[PDB]
Each structure stands twice: as structure tokens, then as C-alpha cells.
Amino acid sequence: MPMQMFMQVYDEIQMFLLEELELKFDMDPNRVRYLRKMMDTTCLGGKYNRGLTVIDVAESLLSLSGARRKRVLHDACVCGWMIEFLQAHYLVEDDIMDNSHPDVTVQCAINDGLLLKSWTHMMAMHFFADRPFLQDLLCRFNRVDYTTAVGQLYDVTSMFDSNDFAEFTLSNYKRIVKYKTAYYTYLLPLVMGLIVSEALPTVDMGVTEELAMLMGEYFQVQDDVMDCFTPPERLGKVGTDIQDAKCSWLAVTFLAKASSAQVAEFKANYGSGDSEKVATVRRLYEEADLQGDYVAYEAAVAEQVKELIEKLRLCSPGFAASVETLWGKT
Amino acid sequence: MPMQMFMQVYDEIQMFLLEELELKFDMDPNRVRYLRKMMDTTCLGGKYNRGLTVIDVAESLLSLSGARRKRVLHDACVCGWMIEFLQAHYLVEDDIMDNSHPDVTVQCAINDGLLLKSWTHMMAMHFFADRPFLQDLLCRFNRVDYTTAVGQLYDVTSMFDSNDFAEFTLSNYKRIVKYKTAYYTYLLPLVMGLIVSEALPTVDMGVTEELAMLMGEYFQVQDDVMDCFTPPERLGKVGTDIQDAKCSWLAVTFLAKASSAQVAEFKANYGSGDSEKVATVRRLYEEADLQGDYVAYEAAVAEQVKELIEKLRLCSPGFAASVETLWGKT
Ligand code: NA
Ligand code: NA
């Protein structure tokens, strides 16, 4: 029922957006169909974990506070699609960076990026035009989107000096994860589920914010290890962090426990496309027992997670229910 | 006094934004300075016509409706910087399209584009946190930004079929100008000057919208002709519309009055980098007396402009004052 509902509201949002273009923005049918396909292609086909989390939070809060039900849930669905569309926007932006007379496909990818983000505003202004929370929703949403762009800057410049391994530390790794991933993937759906459920000021936000960061950290450490050690046809992509000299959990953990000569061997081989240099890096990570340390690190985070939901439940018990479901996904 | 005031508020907005990053988003000094320079580089150095227009409207409405003065004017200044930053955002987006291992400059240009847009939200949420109009301001602003991205799509795809000269018509040329340029360059500063001056529901918006479109059309026709006929060191750039096969005023006007063989000669030579093909196009435009028709066309638009402000003044006389100043710039 959650997914079947989420997908129906998608059709509803899509038809409003495309009818709006045709009726209020003078769009020809050829371009409407082109945008219907681009929307389908960029917004559909993931797991919808961010979007469904809004619904899950919402349903858990109408069970522990008729017509308010179906409206809060519909609101929840539109909120989840705002996050999915924002996610679509970020993935188009990432594609432009690596994909490369006016190049009309790059022009259209830029244009797609702008439209996907504006669509989050358009669907909110329409479907929440009459809700008292529209303005708070907008600001919290805009602020989390800013946070993400700030975290993208931290990430993309982690190996340089904005006009290098000094920023390859664990606290900075956590800064990158917090801003680039945790705020919009974990905190934002939780917060939107509370906004549409009217229950915003009823929760310890500090513990909530703390839990979102920790879950994103757990998720990203596993992600970093799989990028390096899960082979492509099992990972789903070609893992590229070593070539791209990412500030990954493996890299910052290796630097803390490597010998001087090893660090020199790591520094000489990192950030290179050459297959033996990447293999040398994997060899070093292996010999440092990083996949051993991976298990322990996640365990400790899980304990902080498995224990931090309980504070949250002392004053907001239904919230804590969905936060555990979100955590079970991670 | 307007510009001296506009520039002071810039310093005020910049320091809030950069202190916010340092204090609330964990930013290191090296990156703060990097972003201070990027902001300076992208937002400063134009003519500030959009931004000052907000001030001009505001001052004209406190003269025909002490403490409300200096606050409405400050609000006006922040509104003008929102539009200048949005303009900065669009120019970075355009640069990415033509400017072209992870390419860190293209990554940073994408990132710059996102930050410039988020900054318009951040400065509004801060400086207007307590104004009753924040939510209306946001929505009208978001909607005009959507309009612009819709007009960019119209523009970039005017010579193809989104998955060709049929869309080279005058009504479609006006659609492109309306969405891509007029709404954010002419209508948006007028509307924001009214919002901060509380005078929104006091004006005939239809005549206002009609005037903004017409002024943008006037401005863009002149722009199109200069792109083709003003030599570079006098224009400021290398005019490129013929190579880029733009749906320009010259092109759609030439197609209406060319002979069959000429249209074939135009169609064979348009959208090419080769210098003689571009010269052949300029030769055709010349022999069709397009710079003759240019003068008459602008004259007729000017008459529609020079006459449409008067309707507006019958019910909103102070508004009409600034609209004439904006028109005098064009
Ligand atoms: Na998701
Ligand atoms: Na301007």
C-alpha cells in the first residue's frame, strides 16, 4: 500500500506539472512529452527510500498523536516526491561533471537539472498552497538543499586547496558525509514526515539530528568499502574512489595506521587511473586489515544508533518507530 | 545614493552569508575566502539594472502610498541582490554549457551555480524572516525562476525537435523572450519593489505583465541586431547567433520576406562556423533591409510601451514613474 500509494501520487504530481506547462507556460505537446519522459527517466527506478520514509513517519504519527488522515498522508506523498525530485536533480548535476558548436545534450542536461529542482517548488506551492506549514516547509527544504551543495564543495575539494592529504581526517570525513549526504537522505525525510503530521515541535531535534548523521555515516562507510572491494557486476557500477582520490573512510583510516614508507607508497599511488597503482592501494588497504576495522567501526556506530532511538522514544514514541524502520534499511 | 546604498547592503549580505558558513556550516577560512572571491567575481561588475530597479520602485512608492522608510528600502536592497545573484546563477549555468579524471573546475562551476541560487533563498530567509510577505516573495521568486528555465528550454531547442525552421516564427520568438528574459529581468524587479512596498494588490498586473514583456522584446531585438552588426570591440563580445543557429529576430524576420531560393541559401548557410557562410547570412540580412525594419519595429513597440504606462498610472501613479525609468534604460 505505501508504494502503490506513492506511485499514484507521482502520476498526480506529474500530470499537474505537465498540464501546468501546457496551460500556463505555453508549452507545445512535443516538449511536454519530452519532459514527461525526462521526468520518468530521472525520478523513477530507484528504491524510493527517502520518499517512502516520509510516508512511514506520517503513518506512525497518525497512530499516536478520518479526513485529517487521508490529507496528511497525501501531503506526505507529495513531500516524498519533493525529495526524490531533489535527488534526481543532484544526480543530473553529478552526471554533467563526469560526462565531459553548442552541445545541445549538455545544454539539455543543465536545463534538466534546473527543471528538476524547480519542480520541487512548483509541486509544493500547488499541493500545499493552503497549508499553514508551506513557508516553514520551504525554508527547511531550501536550507537542506544548501547544506547539500556545501557538502558537495567539501567533497570535491578534499584533495586540493581551494583558490593534498591534510584534510584526510576522520572528523572531516564526517563533515563531508553530514553535509553531502546525511541531511537530505536521513534528516530531511524525517523532518518532512513531522511537518505534514503537525508534530514538528514535539520531538528532540538534537537526538534526531544526531541519529540522521550517524545513520548516514554508517551507510557511507559501508558504501566506501563496497566501492573498493565489491566487484562491479555485484556492486552495480565501477568503483572509482581511488582513481578519483576521494576522502573515503578507507583512505583516512589507512593514513592513521600506516608506516611512514607505506604512506609514501599510498601517496605515490593514490588518485591515479593506472590499474597497478589502484591495485597497489587495494593491496595496502588489505594488508592494513581495513575490512577487519570496518566491521568493528560499523558495530560501534550501530550501538550508538541502537541506543540513541531510545532517548527519542521517551518523549516521541511513534517517531522512534519509523526511525528504526529507516535504520533497518541501512 | 541608490548605488552607494546597494553596494553597502551587498557587503552586509556577503558577511552574513560567509559568517553563516563559518559559524553554522563548519567552513574553514580557506574555503570562506574562496567563496567570498567567487561571489565577488560572479555577482559584481555588471550594471545592476535589475537590482536597482527594485530600489527605484520602492522609493517611488514611499513618496505616494520614518522607520517604515529605511526598512522598506533595506528590504528593497536585499531583493535587488536576490535578482543579481539569480542572474549570476544563470550566467554560471550558461558558462558550463560552452566551456566544454574528475575535472575539478567543471565540478566547481556546477557547485558555484547551486550556491548562487541557494544564496538567494538564504539571504531572503534571514533578512525577511519576520516579514509577512516572505512566503509570497518566495513563491513568486521561485515561479519566475522556473519560468526562466522553461524559456531556456524553448531557446536551446528552437532549431530541433526535442526527443529545423518550423519554430522560426515571430510568436515563438516572443515566447522565448518572454520566458527566458522578460519575466526575471523586467517583471520580477517591478514585482519585488511592490512586495516590499506593500503595494502588490494596488496595481493592474495585466498591464504590468504586458509592459515587462514588451520592454524585454524591445531590448532583445536590439540585442539580436547588435549581435550581428556591432563589431566585437564595440559590442563587448564576439556575436555568435548565426553560428549557433539562434531563433533571433533577424532570422524570423528574414524568413517572412525572403524568396524561395534565398530561403534555400539561408537554410544552407545558417548554423555554421565557417566564416563565409556567416558572412553570406549577414549579406542576406543586409539585402533584405533588416536594419531598416529594425528601426520601425522598435518604434512601434516603443509606442505600445510609451502608451501602456499611462493605463498603469491612472490607478498606480508612482509605480508608473519607476516603470518609465526602467524603460528609459532600455
Ligand atoms: Na530515495
Ligand atoms: Na541586473
Tell if the CB–CB gap between B122 and A100 is shorter than 8 Å. Answer: no
| A6 Cα–ligand 2 center, Å | 42
8 Å CB contact between A183 and A151: yes
CA distance A177 to chain B (A): 13
Tell if the CB–CB gap between A111 and B31 is shorter than 8 Å. Answer: no
Tell me which chain B residues have a C-beta less than 8 angstroms from the C-beta of A104: 156-157, 160
Whats the size of chain B, residue-wise? 330
**Chain B contact present for A149, CB below 8 A:** yes
Residue A75 counted as an annotated binding residue: no
Q: Count of alpha carbons within 13 Å of B131, Cβ hemisphere only?
A: 23
**Cell of residue A116, nine digits:** 528538476
Nearest to B142 among A93, A118, A156 (CB): A118
**How far apart (Å, rounded) are the C-alpha atoms in residues B31 and A158?**
11
**How far apart (Å, rounded) are the C-alpha atoms in residues A299 and A83?**
29
| Backbone interruptions in chain A following residues (C to N > 2.5 Å) | 65, 100, 163
Tell if the CB–CB gap between B143 and A122 is shorter than 8 Å. Answer: yes
Q: Give me the resolution in angstroms, 1 decimal.
A: 1.6
Number of the ligand closest to the Cα of B46 = 2
Nearest to B102 among A149, A162, A244 (CB): A244
8 Å CB contact between B151 and B216: no
Q: Count of alpha carbons within 13 Å of A129, Cβ hemisphere only?
A: 5
- With CA atoms as reference, report the closest residue to B211 among B303, B79, B286: B303
**How far apart (Å, rounded) are the C-alpha atoms in residues A115 and A127?**
18
**Chain B contact present for A118, CB below 8 A:** yes
| B49 Cα–ligand 2 center, Å | 4
**How far apart (Å, rounded) are the C-alpha atoms in residues B49 and B13?**
18
Binding-site positions of B for Mg(2+): 94-95, 98, 155, 223, 227, 241
- With CA atoms as reference, report the closest residue to B195 among B185, B181, B205: B205
Q: If contacts are CB pairs under 8 Å, which of residues 259-288 in chain B contact chain A?
A: 273
**Chain A contact present for B301, CB below 8 A:** no
Classify the phi-psi angles of B247: left when phi > 0, otherwise alpha if psi is within -120 to 50, otherwise beta.
Answer: beta
Q: Count of alpha carbons within 13 Å of B102, Cβ hemisphere only?
A: 23
Instruction: Classify residue B236 by its DSSP letter.
Output: S
Tell if the CB–CB gap between A145 and B34 is shorter than 8 Å. Answer: no
8 Å CB contact between A244 and B102: yes
| Backbone interruptions in chain B following residues (C to N > 2.5 Å) | 65, 100, 163
CA angle, B18 then B195 then B50, to 5° = 60
* Residue B310 exposed, middle or buried by CB count within 10 Å (0-12, 13-18, 19+): exposed
**How far apart (Å, rounded) are the C-alpha atoms in residues A97 and A152?**
12
8 Å CB contact between A30 and B162: yes
Determine the angle formed by the axes of helices B104-127 and B2-24, rounding to 10 degrees: 110
**How far apart (Å, rounded) are the C-alpha atoms in residues B306 and B321?**
12
Query: What are the C-alpha distances in Å from A81 to residues A6, A208, B291?
Result: 8, 22, 50
**Chain B contact present for A114, CB below 8 A:** yes
Tell me which chain B residues have a C-beta less than 8 angstroms from the C-beta of A21: 150
> Which residue has cell 591515479?
A272
**Cell of residue A223, nine digits:** 558504501
Cα torsion for B142, A80, A150, B83, to the nearest 10°?
Answer: 0
**How far apart (Å, rounded) are the C-alpha atoms in residues A55 and A63?**
13
Tell if the CB–CB gap between A31 and B162 is shorter than 8 Å. Answer: yes
**How far apart (Å, rounded) are the C-alpha atoms in residues A73 and A57?**
10
8 Å CB contact between B189 and B51: yes
**How far apart (Å, rounded) are the C-alpha atoms in residues B291 and B207?**
29
Nearest to A149 among B114, B139, B156 (CB): B114
**Chain A contact present for B130, CB below 8 A:** no
| B299 Cα–ligand 2 center, Å | 24
**Chain A contact present for B25, CB below 8 A:** yes
Nearest to A149 among B97, B115, B273 (CB): B115
Amino acid identity, position A212: A
**Cell of residue A303, nine digits:** 550501538
Tell if the CB–CB gap between B153 and A111 is shorter than 8 Å. Answer: yes
**Cell of residue A290, nine digits:** 581495513
| B45 Cα–ligand 2 center, Å | 10
8 Å CB contact between A157 and B104: yes
Cα-Cα-Cα-Cα dihedral sign, residues B208, B323, B326, B211: positive
- Quote the strand ranges of A86-245, DSSP E: none
Other C-beta atoms within 10 Å of B102: how many? 15
**Chain A contact present for B143, CB below 8 A:** yes
Alpha helices (H) in A62-133, listed in sequence order: 67-99, 104-127
**Chain B contact present for A91, CB below 8 A:** no
Tell me which chain A residues have a C-beta less than 8 angstroms from the C-beta of B97: 102-103, 106-107, 110
Helix, strand, coil shares of chain B, percent, nearest 5, are: 80, 0, 20
Tell me which chain B residues have a C-beta less than 8 angstroms from the C-beta of A244: 102
Residue of A16, A22, A26 to mutate for B, most B C-beta atoms under 10 A: A26
Tell if the CB–CB gap between A106 and B97 is shorter than 8 Å. Answer: yes
**Cell of residue A70, nine digits:** 487521508
CA distance B76 to chain A (A): 20
Residues ≥6 apart with Cβ < 8 Å to B224: B241, B246, B248, B249, B250
**How far apart (Å, rounded) are the C-alpha atoms in residues B41 and B95?**
14
- With CA atoms as reference, report the closest residue to B41 among B14, B74, B78: B14
8 Å CB contact between A203 and A315: yes
| B284 Cα–ligand 1 center, Å | 54
Determine the angle formed by the axes of helices A275-287 and A205-229, rounding to 10 degrees: 120
- With CA atoms as reference, report the closest residue to B22 among B31, B13, B9: B31
CA distance B142 to chain A (A): 7
* Residue B94 exposed, middle or buried by CB count within 10 Å (0-12, 13-18, 19+): middle
| B54 Cα–ligand 2 center, Å | 10
Cα-Cα-Cα-Cα dihedral sign, residues B261, B263, B267, B271: positive
**How far apart (Å, rounded) are the C-alpha atoms in residues B31 and B8?**
23
> Which residue has cell 597503482?
A277
**How far apart (Å, rounded) are the C-alpha atoms in residues B117 and B91?**
11
**Chain B contact present for A27, CB below 8 A:** yes
